[PDB]
Amino acid sequence: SEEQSHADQDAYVADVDGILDVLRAQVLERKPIFQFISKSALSLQSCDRINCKVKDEQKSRALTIIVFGASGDLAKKKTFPALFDLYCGGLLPPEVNIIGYARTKVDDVEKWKHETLMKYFSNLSERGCHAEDFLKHISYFCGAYDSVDDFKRLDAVIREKENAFKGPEKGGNRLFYLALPPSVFASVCESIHKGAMPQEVGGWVRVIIEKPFGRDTKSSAELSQALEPFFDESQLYRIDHYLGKEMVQNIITTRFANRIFSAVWNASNIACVQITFKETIGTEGRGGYFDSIGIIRDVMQNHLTQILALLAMEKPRSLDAECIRDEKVSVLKCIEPITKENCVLGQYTASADGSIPGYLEDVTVPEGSTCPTFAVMRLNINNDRWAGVPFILKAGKAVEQKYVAIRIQFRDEVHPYGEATQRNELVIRAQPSEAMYVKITTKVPGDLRQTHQTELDLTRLPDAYESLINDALLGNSTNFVRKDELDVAWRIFTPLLHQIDSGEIKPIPYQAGTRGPKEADEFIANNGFKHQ
Amino acid sequence: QDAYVADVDGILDVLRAQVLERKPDIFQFISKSALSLQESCDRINCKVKDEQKSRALTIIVFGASGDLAKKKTFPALFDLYCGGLLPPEVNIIGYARTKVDDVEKWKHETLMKYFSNLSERGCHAEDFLKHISYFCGAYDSVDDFKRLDAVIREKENAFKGPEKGGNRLFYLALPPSVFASVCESIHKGAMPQEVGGWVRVIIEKPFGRDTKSSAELSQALEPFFDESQLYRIDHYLGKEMVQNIITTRFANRIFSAVWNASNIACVQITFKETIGTEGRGGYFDSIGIIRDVMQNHLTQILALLAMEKPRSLDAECIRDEKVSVLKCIEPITKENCVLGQYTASADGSIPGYLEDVTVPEGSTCPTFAVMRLNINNDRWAGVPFILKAGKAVEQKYVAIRIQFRDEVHPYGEATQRNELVIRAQPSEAMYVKITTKVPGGDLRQTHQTELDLTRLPDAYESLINDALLGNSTNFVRKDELDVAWRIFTPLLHQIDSGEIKPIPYQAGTRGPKEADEFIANNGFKHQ
Amino acid sequence: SEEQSHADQDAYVADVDGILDVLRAQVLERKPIFQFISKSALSLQSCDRINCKVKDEQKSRALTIIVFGASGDLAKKKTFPALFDLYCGGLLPPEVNIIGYARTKVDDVEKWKHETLMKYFSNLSERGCHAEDFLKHISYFCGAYDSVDDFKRLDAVIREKENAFKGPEKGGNRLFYLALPPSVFASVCESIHKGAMPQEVGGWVRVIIEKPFGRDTKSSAELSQALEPFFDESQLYRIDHYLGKEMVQNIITTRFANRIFSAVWNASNIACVQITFKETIGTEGRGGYFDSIGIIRDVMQNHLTQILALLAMEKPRSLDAECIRDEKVSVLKCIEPITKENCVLGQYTASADGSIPGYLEDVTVPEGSTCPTFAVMRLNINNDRWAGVPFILKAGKAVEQKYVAIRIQFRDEVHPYGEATQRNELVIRAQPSEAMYVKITTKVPGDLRQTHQTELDLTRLPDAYESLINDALLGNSTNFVRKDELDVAWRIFTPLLHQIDSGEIKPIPYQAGTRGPKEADEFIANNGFKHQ
Numbered sequence A, C: 001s002e003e004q005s006h007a008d009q010d011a012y013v014a015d016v017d018g019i020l021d022v023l024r025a026q027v028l029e030r031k032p033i034f035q036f037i038s039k040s041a042l043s044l045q046s047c048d049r050i051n052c053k054v055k056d057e058q059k060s061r062a063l064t065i066i067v068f069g070a071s072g073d074l075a076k077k078k079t080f081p082a083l084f085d086l087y088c089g090g091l092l093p094p095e096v097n098i099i100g101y102a103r104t105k106v107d108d109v110e111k112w113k114h115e116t117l118m119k120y121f122s123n124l125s126e127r128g129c130h131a132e133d134f135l136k137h138i139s140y141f142c143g144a145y146d147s148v149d150d151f152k153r154l155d156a157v158i159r160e161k162e163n164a165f166k167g168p169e170k171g172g173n174r175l176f177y178l179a180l181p182p183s184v185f186a187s188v189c190e191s192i193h194k195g196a197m198p199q200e201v202g203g204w205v206r207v208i209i210e211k212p213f214g215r216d217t218k219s220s221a222e223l224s225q226a227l228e229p230f231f232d233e234s235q236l237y238r239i240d241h242y243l244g245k246e247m248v249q250n251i252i253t254t255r256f257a258n259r260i261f262s263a264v265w266n267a268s269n270i271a272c273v274q275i276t277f278k279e280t281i282g283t284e285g286r287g288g289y290f291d292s293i294g295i296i297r298d299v300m301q302n303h304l305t306q307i308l309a310l311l312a313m314e315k316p317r318s319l320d321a322e323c324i325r326d327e328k329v330s331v332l333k334c335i336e337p338i339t340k341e342n343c344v345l346g347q348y349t350a351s352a353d354g355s356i357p358g359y360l361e362d363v364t365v366p367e368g369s370t371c372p373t374f375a376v377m378r379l380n381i382n383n384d385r386w387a388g389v390p391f392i393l394k395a396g397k398a399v400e401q402k403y404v405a406i407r408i409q410f411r412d413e414v415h416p417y418g419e420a421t422q423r424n425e426l427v428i429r430a431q432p433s434e435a436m437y438v439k440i441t442t443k444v445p446g447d448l449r450q451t452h453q454t455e456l457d458l459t460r461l462p463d464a465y466e467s468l469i470n471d472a473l474l475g476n477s478t479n480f481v482r483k484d485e486l487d488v489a490w491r492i493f494t495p496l497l498h499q500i501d502s503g504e505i506k507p508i509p510y511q512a513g514t515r516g517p518k519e520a521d522e523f524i525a526n527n528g529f530k531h532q
Numbered sequence B: 001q002d003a004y005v006a007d008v009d010g011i012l013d014v015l016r017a018q019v020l021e022r023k024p025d026i027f028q029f030i031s032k033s034a035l036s037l038q039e040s041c042d043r044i045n046c047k048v049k050d051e052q053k054s055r056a057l058t059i060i061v062f063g064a065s066g067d068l069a070k071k072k073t074f075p076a077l078f079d080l081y082c083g084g085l086l087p088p089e090v091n092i093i094g095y096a097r098t099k100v101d102d103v104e105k106w107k108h109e110t111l112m113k114y115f116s117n118l119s120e121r122g123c124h125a126e127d128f129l130k131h132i133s134y135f136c137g138a139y140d141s142v143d144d145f146k147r148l149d150a151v152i153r154e155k156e157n158a159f160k161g162p163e164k165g166g167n168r169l170f171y172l173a174l175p176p177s178v179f180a181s182v183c184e185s186i187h188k189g190a191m192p193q194e195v196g197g198w199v200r201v202i203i204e205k206p207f208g209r210d211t212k213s214s215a216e217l218s219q220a221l222e223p224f225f226d227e228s229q230l231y232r233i234d235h236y237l238g239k240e241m242v243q244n245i246i247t248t249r250f251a252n253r254i255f256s257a258v259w260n261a262s263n264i265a266c267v268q269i270t271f272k273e274t275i276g277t278e279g280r281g282g283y284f285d286s287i288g289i290i291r292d293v294m295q296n297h298l299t300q301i302l303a304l305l306a307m308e309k310p311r312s313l314d315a316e317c318i319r320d321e322k323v324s325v326l327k328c329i330e331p332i333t334k335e336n337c338v339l340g341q342y343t344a345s346a347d348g349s350i351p352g353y354l355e356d357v358t359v360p361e362g363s364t365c366p367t368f369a370v371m372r373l374n375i376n377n378d379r380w381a382g383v384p385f386i387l388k389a390g391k392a393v394e395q396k397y398v399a400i401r402i403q404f405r406d407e408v409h410p411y412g413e414a415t416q417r418n419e420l421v422i423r424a425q426p427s428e429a430m431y432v433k434i435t436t437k438v439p440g441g442d443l444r445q446t447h448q449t450e451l452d453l454t455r456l457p458d459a460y461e462s463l464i465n466d467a468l469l470g471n472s473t474n475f476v477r478k479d480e481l482d483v484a485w486r487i488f489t490p491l492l493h494q495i496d497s498g499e500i501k502p503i504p505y506q507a508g509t510r511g512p513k514e515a516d517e518f519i520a521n522n523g524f525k526h527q
C-alpha cells in the first residue's frame, strides 16, 4: 500500500500536531514550561554559599596551585576557568592559594585578574556570583623559568601563605601546573626541585605537564629522562584534557561489572572497534603551529590510544589507579607498529561557505605542506582477546560534525534471521554529549521475521578537564599516561610518522565540512565495518 | 515452481542435522552422506493476507454447546473477528448433538452472552452472529458428516473469489475420548473438495496422562491427519512471549553468546495463579499440576528457551530443535521435586483443595510443584532449570528468569548478578538487570538498572490465528510430545505410588517453605 | 578455556551453516541433487530388459524350483519375493519353471499370483516392470505332503515342462524348497524320493529345509537320520536366512588375505569377541509360537554359532565349500558346553510407548512363561588360538536398536601411552547396514601424548536371503550348516537349554526399547569388555 504509506505519514504529522495542541492548552492554563511539558506528556500517554565537598585530608593542610605561563592562552582560557568551576563546585579546599606565574611584568594585578582571567569565566548566573571571591584566592607572580633565585622568591611568597594556614597540619601541598611549551619543562622542574619544593615539616609536590610529550620515541624518552631525577611517577601528571572520567567509567564499569558485557568483549564476538574524534573547526590561523605536529601526534598517539588501552585491556587486579595503568601498558605492548598500508590521510580545503578557509590558504602554513588534518588507520592487537579484530582510530579537523564516540560492532548472526537482523552495536559517545547505548534487534508487537532495530539507553557536574585537575588534587593518576605507557605508545606510531615525513603517504584533499576523503570511508568498509 | 527448493534445503536440513550429530572432514562427510541418500468503538481493520481472502474458509467447532466451546472458543473467534483476523466472508459452524428448534435463540443464549461486552467490541456481536450456523449431529454417524459436507459445500460455492473450493478448520472442542471417531468421520465424510483447500484439525488437552496413553491417541489419529494438519493447542502459550524468547536470543550476538553454561547460573520458569480449582476436581484430581501445566506448557517454553540454533525460522526447523533439546533431558527424579497441596486461606474466605465435592477425600493430588530439570549437552551441562507451577498462591505471575554468573572481580560488592526477565502475566515485560556507573567519583560507585527491551489478540486467540495461517511453530509435535511424556512419566508414577507426598500450604501464601529452600539450594540468589 | 569451548561450538555450527549456504546457492543455479552436492563439497574442500548373468551350465538344462507351503507366510512374504529379485537381477535361467505346491485348493491361480504373491513384490520402479513376466514362470500345484501319487502327478507336471526345454541338455534340475513345519520334512523328502526325483537322462536334486532343525541334540540327530536315506549332504541345504555372503567375505577375506589381520587373530592379542543380534520388534502376537522356542534356539544355536565358527576357525586348506565347512566343524568341537553361570536371560515387558505390548500380555503366551526374549552368554573355545578369550553371543528382541555386528576388542597397550590410548577394535556390522572398520589411535596434527581415536573404513545387489538361494542354485554349500556341524552345535547348547527348561535360570524383566537387563551389560563388563 503506497497510498496508505503516504496517508500514514500525513496522519503521523497531524497526530503529532494534536498532542502538541493539548500540551499547549494546559501550558496556557497553569503557565509556570520545559519541566511541565515533561510530566503532562508522560501523563495519559541561584547564588548560594559554596557547599564544600572536599575530604578531611584536603582541608587538613594548606594547598597552593601554581600555574606557570599564567598569561598564556591555555592558562587564561582553560586552566583558570576550570579552577573557577572547581571552586564553585566546592572541590577546592576553602583556603586555597592560586599563584599565576608568568615571565612578563604586570603593573596592575587587579586589572590582570579582571581583564585577562575573569573574561573567560563562565557567565552562568549560578556562577559569577562567586567570581570576585575566587579572584581573592589568585595572586600574580613574575619571574624567569630558568633562574633559581626566582623560585626561592616564589617559595617565600608561598611559605608566607602556608604559615598563615588556620587549620591542623603544618607546611603545605603544592600543585605545579606547567601550562608551557615543552622546551622549558626541564628547567622549570629543576628550578622547582632546587628552589620551591614543599616545606620539610610536610606537604606533597605534584606537577601537571601539558602536551606534546615528545614527537617520536627518541624525543619522548629524552624528555622523560630529563624529568625523572626531579619527579617520579607518583608526582608527575601528563594531562590529556579530553579524557573524561564519565567516559572512563562507561568503558570500565559497563564491561567489567557485568557478565553479559565481559563475555562478548573479545574476538569471538566483535567484528570491529572504532574510536572517532571529529571536529568542525579548522586550524584557525594556528596552521603554522599545527603544521609541525599533524593530526596523528595531535590527538591519535595520545588521546585515542589512551581510550584504546582502557577499551582493550585485560581485567585489572583491582580498580586501584596503578593496577589500571599496569593493564593499559600490558595491552599496548601487544600492538604492532602501524603500517603505511593501514593509514589514509587527508588535508582539508575551503568549506563550501568560506567560513573555514583551506589549510594551505593560511599564510603561516609553508607552501608544499603535506601535514595531515585527517587520518584513519587500523591497529592490530595481537593477544588471545583481540587477534584479528580491526581497531580503527579516526580523527579529523574541519569535518561534518563535532563528535567523539566509541563504536563496537559485533558479528552478525546470519542464521536463522538473515536479513531480518543486523549487527549489534555498542556505542559510547562523549561528544557532543554523553550517551551509551546498544542497538539490538527485537520483535515487533502484533511473524517471527518481523523485526525492529531498537536502541537501549544504558545512560552542573565537572567537565572532562575539570575532573582531571580534581583527580590530580586527590592523587588519582588513572587517567594520566605513565612513562612506560608513553614510550610504548610512541613505538606504535613512530615508524608511520617517519614514513609520512619521508613523503611515502600524501594527504587526500577534502572540502572542509564533508566527512573527509572518500578513500577513508572505503578503508573502514574494507576493514570490518558494515553499514546499516 | 517452488517445490524444488522446499525439497533442496529440505535435503540440506538432513545434512545439517547429520553433521551436527556426528561432528566429523566436514566436506568428506557431506559427500559421504549425499552418496548414501539415493468508550471508543474501534471498527474492524482487515489484517488478513491475500491468500486468506482468496478461497472459502469454514470453521467447524465440534462440541459447540460444551463449556469450552461456548465460553472460550466462540468468544475467542469473536475477538479475532473484531481484530480483523478472520476473512470477511468466514463461515462458522457450531456442531453438537442436541436438537435445536430455535437456532437464532441458541446463538443469543449459548454464545453471545459469553462474548466480551467491552465497549470497543460490543457493536460487532450481532454482525458476527451472522457468520454462525448451528448443526445437529453425532460424532460417528457417516450420514451426519455427509450432510455436514453438503451444508459446508453450499457456503463454499456461494463464495465469490479467485480460488475454487474451501479451506476447512475442524475445532475439536470435545472430550479426548471422541477425537479418533470424529477424525475418522471427517476423513471419510467431509475433507475439503479435491479442487482445492487445506484441512486442519485443532485438538484440546489432555493429550494423554502418560507416555503410553498419549502415544495411543497419537496412533489413533495418525492414519487420518499428519503433523502439518494436526494442531494440539495450548491455551496459555502466547505469540508475544515466544517471540521474546526466539528473537531476543537468536537475532542478536550479544544474547546468543551468553546463552550457555559458561555464563548462566540458573533459569526459572514460573507459572503462578491466585485462583484455585473449586468445582474442577473432575478435570483436575486425576491430572494434577504437573500434567496440567508443566509437562505441556512449561516444557514447551523450556524447549524454546534451551534449543540449539535452527537453520531457518520455518516452523518445522524450530520444532526439530525443540525435539533435539528435550531429548537431552534426563527423566525427573523424586529427589528433584517438591510437591504442595493447598488448604483454606488464613482469613478463611477461600476453601482448601480437599474441601470440594468434586474432589475425593484424602486426595494426594498436587496443586503446586517445583522441580529441577537437568539438560545434559554441551550448552547446558550443570545448569539448573527450575520449573515452578502453583495454584492458589500469592500472585498471578508467569515469567522466565535467567540469572547470569556474577563477576566477583574486580567490583565485588559494587556489582551483583545480571538477570534477564521475560514476563507474560499479569502484564508483558522484558528487561535485563545490569550494573552501571553513577556520576558524581570512585570507579566503585555503581547502580542497578533495569533496561527495558521494548485491542490485540490474546494468547489463545494468537494460537487460533496461527492455525488459520498454517504456522505450527507453537504447537507440540507428535515426537516432541512423546519425549516430554518420557521426561515426566516415571516421576508421575513415583508420585501415584506415594514415594513423594504433597506438603500443605494455606491458599494465598507463596506455597511450601521447602519449595523456596529447594530453589536457593539449586543455584538461585536473591539480592 | 571454558569460554572458548562454548565459542568454538557456536563457531562450528555457524561454519556448517556457511558451507551449506554455498552448496545451496550452486544447487539453485544448476538445479539437476544428492549426486551434485557430493562433488561440489569435495570440490574446494528404469525398466530395461533383464541382462542375464547366469553361467553356461545353468542355461544348458531345464531348471524347476518347487516351493512347498507356497501359500504360507514364509513363502509368500519371503521366498517368492526373493525369487523375483533373483529374476530381476538376471540370476535365474531364462526358462525357469517355478511351482507353488500347497495343501489347499485355489479356484483362481491368476488371482492367487496377483493377490497372494505379487503384493509382497518390491514395488521399486526398477522392479515391478518385470512382475507380470515373472508371474508367467509361476504355477500353482495342489496336493498332500505325504501321498506318493500326488508327487507323481507333480513329477508329470514337471516333466511336461522339462521336455519342452528349448536348449542343449535333457531332463532337468529340480530345487525343492521346503517352506514347511519340520514335522512334515521327512514325509515330503520321502515322497520326493519315491515319486519326483529328476529324470534319469539327467539333472540334480537339491532340497532347502527351513529351521528349526531339532530343539536339542537328540531331536536334531533324529531329523538328520530321517532325511539322510533320501538326500546326502551335497543335496541337503539347511538355510539360515540371516547369513549374508557379504558378511562372510568380510570375515574370511579381511583376515586370511592379509598378514596384518591374520597375525593378531588370536589369544595373544584379542581381549574379547562379541557377536550381537538385536531387534526392535517383539514377538508380535506370535508369542505362543516363540514360547516353545526361545531366543537361544531361535537365533543363537543356529545363526550366531555359524558366525562364530567362521570367525574362530583355523585357515582352511582351500576356499572350496567343503574345506570351509570342515574348519567350522573343527572349531566348534573345541567349544565347551555353555554353563548356566555363563548365561543371563531377559524377558521384555511393555515399551514406554505401548507400541510393543509386554511378552506376557500376549494371550497366546501361557501364564507363568519363563521364555527368554533376550540372552547374553559366554562361550570358551579351548584351542591354541583362543584359549582364555571371551566369546560373547548376545541376542535380543524388543531392545533399543535393530543391529547385527561382530565386535573384536584387542588388548590395550598400557605402556607407553597409558590413558592417551585405548583398546583397538575391529567391527563387522551387517545391520542396519554394511560397515567394517578398525578403531586405532593416531597422532593429532600440530606433543606425543596428544592422540585421537579414528575409524578407518575398510569398506541393487542381492540381499542376504537372496544370495543363499542363488548359492543353492550354483551348488555352493559354504554358508549352510552341515549335518556334523549341526550335531556339534547342539551339544554346545543342549545342557544350558535343559537347565533353563528345568527352571534353574529365570529371565530378568526389561522394558521393551531399552538395552535389556542391567545384569547383562555388567556380565559383558565382567567377561573382558572395556568401554571407551
Ligand SMILES: O=P(O)(O)OC[C@H]1O[C@@H](O)[C@H](O)[C@@H](O)[C@@H]1O
Pocket: B236, B237, B238, B239, B240, B241, B242, B271, B297, B301, B398, B423, B424, B425, B428, B458, B459
Ligand atoms: O501475552 P503474551 O506475551 O502473548 O503470552 C501469553 C502468555 O500467557 C501465560 O499465561 C503463559 O504461561 C505464557 O507461556 C504465554 O506466553
